[PDB]
Amino acid sequence: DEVSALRYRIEWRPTGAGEPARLDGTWLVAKYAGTADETSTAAREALESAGARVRELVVDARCGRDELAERLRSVGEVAGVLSLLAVDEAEPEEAPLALASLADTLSLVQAMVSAELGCPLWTVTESAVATGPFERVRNAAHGALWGVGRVIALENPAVWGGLVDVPAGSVAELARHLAAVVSGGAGEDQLALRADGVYGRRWVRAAAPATDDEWKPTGTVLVTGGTGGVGGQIARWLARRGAPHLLLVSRSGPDADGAGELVAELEALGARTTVAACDVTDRESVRELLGGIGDDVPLSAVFHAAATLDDGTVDTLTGERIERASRAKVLGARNLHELTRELDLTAFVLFSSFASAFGAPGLGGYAPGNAYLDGLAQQRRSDGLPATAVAWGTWAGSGMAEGPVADRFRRHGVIEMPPETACRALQNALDRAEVCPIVIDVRWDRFLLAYTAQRPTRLFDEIDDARR
Ligand SMILES: NC(=O)C1=CN([C@@H]2O[C@H](COP(=O)(O)OP(=O)(O)OC[C@@H]3O[C@@H](n4cnc5c(N)ncnc54)[C@H](OP(=O)(O)O)[C@@H]3O)[C@@H](O)[C@H]2O)C=CC1
């Protein structure tokens, strides 16, 4: 089954370090002024009890890489740095990726590289991930740290220690495992600490939709980025599924290239299609769009494919840059979320990416926005609302023209999927109500060699094909 070999999901399996062998040297604890004091004290005593001197580094919000580079050069020799920037962090207004902890995490990493400390950075987050459906993601933006983090580990393994999540407001777990985590031979760099043990992030193959639950499109289905490559294939699938009415949105709208043939193609499949110009980053524009939907054909589902790729190295990335470039995906999602929350939707699908599922060099700026969607989908489900964040691999029938990039991808273990097949995996994911399904064609032989090129990983320990 070509549709069952593309299905994966993220699970958190119990695990441990493996003899911490205590510590040795001085450790720096990065934190904002008068913030995460309780957690800092916990980390200090924990690290010190392991035989290591602990000094703190008070960071000024959005200070920049330069300031931190000068300061890290006078600190002397450092064994490692523990970041608490994302701990006890407020969740005010502005854009979600405007988070100070994201901007400063990048600055600390860049600063450590320039100062040439030669030590790894370990970042702590609070309820940024969920080990199970019963746990709620506190702020979906904190997941962006995990998304960019996975890329940084691939681009500069020496400076990146790993990511550790703990229950918000709790310091017990950290004080008990931090020592082993930072000095373990397991190689775990993506962990979640809970009152009931330590868990590691793992990829696992998904089963099959052995349920009578079959998602069907009704009323009006809205597709953002509907006139784009992937959006257009989704629209075709919906039409073939029997969708009565389709609303395709993009900034270009009717002026989109190929829009005419798309509409004709969709209606030729038996679906009244409408194409409108609408910038999903404009709150009022979206509202007016939703208020324009007929009463006889109420909105039943949203497919958010709107986005823009960036491409760039971590050394050239900044919190500001990332927030700016991913507005359509992030603000579009947040806007659609808050404006349709009261509607009786049967499906709310966010288009994530392999960029956040495992990450890859070059996509450090793209990974953050995709990770935000993953968390936002989990939060909706925790609140009793429908949501699916699909982490897509590459697509074959889309606008991927290729020159240097596609060829490198395929010999790296990632093959583009036929559009029709990708959509059928989505259908199966909906039928089983999977919150964050991963749909990608990966050839593990070639993949593992390219992924573990210069850094070991346990992410795929439960993958049979990756096991062999
Ligand atoms: N193709 C690939 O290699 C990969 C794709 N994927 C997945 O596929 C998804 C779909 O995107 P894809 O088709 O590949 O990309 P495309 O860039 O081909 O873009 C669709 C386009 O979407 C629309 N859009 C952009 N900004 C806005 C906005 N503010 N409001 C409304 N619509 C907007 C626009 O339509 P218009 O011009 O009409 O304004 C835009 O031109 C991704 O988001 C990702 O989840 C993941 C990995 C790789």
- Domains contained in the chain, CATH given: 1-468 (3.40.50.720)
Is the distance from the beta carbon of residue 231 to the nearest atom of ligand 1 less than 6 Å?
yes
Is the distance from the beta carbon of residue 83 to the nearest atom of ligand 1 less than 6 Å?
no
Structure tokens at 185: 């031979």
Amino acid at 294: G
**Please, are residues 185 and 5 in contact by the beta-carbon 8 Å criterion?**
no
| Residues carrying an active site annotation | 366
Q: How far, in Å, from the CA of 113 to the mean position of ligand 1?
A: 34
Task: Report how far residue 314's alpha carbon sits from residue 367's, in angstroms, rounded to the nearest whole number.
Answer: 11
CA atoms within 13 A on the CB side of 269: 20
Residue 385: which of 342, 354, 418 has the closest Cα?
Answer: 342
Rounded to a whole number of angstroms, the CA Rg of the chain reads 23
Task: Work out the widest C-alpha separation in the chain, in whole angstroms.
Answer: 72
Task: Report how far residue 438's alpha carbon sits from residue 202's, in angstroms, rounded to the nearest whole number.
Answer: 12
Task: Report how far residue 247's alpha carbon sits from residue 276's, in angstroms, rounded to the nearest whole number.
Answer: 8
303 annotated as ligand-binding: no
Is the distance from the beta carbon of residue 81 to the nearest atom of ligand 1 less than 6 Å?
no
Residue 355: which of 153, 151, 203 has the closest Cα?
Answer: 151
CA 316 vs CA 87, 152, 271, 320: distances in Å:
25, 12, 45, 11
- ∠ CA 305-225-142, nearest 5°, is 40
- ∠ CA 60-66-71, nearest 5°, is 70
Q: How far, in Å, from the CA of 91 to the mean position of ligand 1?
A: 28
Residue with tokens 């580990």: 153
Beta strands in 129-256 (DSSP E): 160-166, 190-194, 197-205, 220-224, 245-250
